[PDB]
Amino acid sequence: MGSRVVILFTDIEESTALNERIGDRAWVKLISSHDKLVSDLVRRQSGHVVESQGDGFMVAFARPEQAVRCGIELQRALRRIRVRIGIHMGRSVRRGDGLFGRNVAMAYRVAAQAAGGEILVSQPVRDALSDGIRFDDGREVELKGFSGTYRLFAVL
Amino acid sequence: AMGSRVVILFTDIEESTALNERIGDRAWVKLISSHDKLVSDLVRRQSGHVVESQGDGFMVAFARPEQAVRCGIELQRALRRNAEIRVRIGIHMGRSVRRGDGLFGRNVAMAYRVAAQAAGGEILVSQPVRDALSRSDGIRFDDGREVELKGFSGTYRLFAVL
Ligand SMILES: Nc1nc2c(ncn2[C@@H]2O[C@H](COP(=O)(O)OP(=O)(O)OP(=O)(O)O)[C@@H](O)[C@H]2O)c(=O)[nH]1
Ligand SMILES: Nc1nc2c(ncn2[C@@H]2O[C@H](COP(=O)(O)OP(=O)(O)OP(=O)(O)O)[C@@H](O)[C@H]2O)c(=O)[nH]1
Ligand SMILES: [Ca+2]
Ligand SMILES: [Ca+2]
Helix, strand or coil, rough: CEEEEEEEEEEEHHHHHHHHHHHHHHHHHHHHHHHHHHHHHHHHHCEEEEECCCCCEEEEEEEHHHHHHHHHHHHHHHCCCCCEEEEEEEEEEECEEEEEEEHHHHHHHHHHHHCCCCCEHHHHHHHHCCCCCEEEECECCCCCCCCCEEEEECCC | CCCCEEEEEEEEEEEEEHHHHHHHHHHHHHHHHHHHHHHHHHHHHCCCCEEEECCCCEEECCCCHHHHHHHHHHHHHHCCCCCCEEEEEEEEEEEEECCEEEEEEEHHHHHHHHHHHHHHHEEEHHHHHHCCCCCCCCCCCCCEEEECCCCCCCCCCEEECC
């Protein structure tokens, strides 16, 4: 239920191991920096950071091309830690300043399937972008909490 | 040293995604709204603070470990009376850093992993929490079990509240 929204999750790979290695002082510095970078890039594509998960973010966009372009630019900027990015779209409930519903959970699982450095999108996102964006042929996976399988597409 | 000492409690609903898929978004939103208010109310009764939400769970801060455990116990009692959702609870203490409306640092991450280890319906606490509550006349623990926690080297003994 709810309004249609594109949901993007970012997540740092193995952030606990990282925190343990470099220590809390360096980690807070790092994540503050990362937060500012992500916020900047999200805003450039007219997105809004909805919520923090500590070593990652939940971001809302009106259009799928905005989300994917944001993901592309974030990976580019990081190459200048490894981050996984997943993107899904569908109706979700935007209540208080949070997002809820099965399509939020699905975006979350799509991000969880992504490798560090990868941008993964669900089939609805892929099908909506058939403007400067190329995809692989997809991979079929089971997603925790959902029945059956889903084809997820990596951005090239 | 960086950070203020705090007791961190995480709650998490077991298999919330599958639950959401069963009951639908409308009923889910109503359910988690009710859950949010239940947790918030019980937390404030033990002088705690809900720091942040993880959708189907919360990060909560307490000054004292007795407060966190009493809260956990009361929450499980409330959830039993209500019953269907099962909530896992994990508690750890140490210094952590506040940034915005969230807590950061290895001891937050540790609390998170202690919670992840807990079964639905269970309260697990780390060894420092158990040790801090040795003298308590009301709080009782089991003998503990050794685990390894993602992101951390070595092993850690975790204790269930009885
Ligand atoms: N501030 C804040 N931190 C959170 C929240 N939810 C989770 N965390 C933190 O997120 C971290 C755990 O993230 P994970 O991604 O599971 O851990 P990881 O070590 O990165 O492992 P992988 O991503 O699986 O490689 C812990 O530090 C948690 O304390 C939140 O809502 N707010
Ligand atoms: N609103 C909100 N939701 C979050 C946040 N972090 C994670 N989530 C949600 O948390 C849910 C996934 O939680 P999990 O505990 O991994 O899923 P689960 O199905 O309960 O699985 P188990 O706990 O392993 O049994 C998804 O619905 C995510 O969208 C957050 O910061 N804010
Ligand atoms: Ca991570
Ligand atoms: Ca859960």
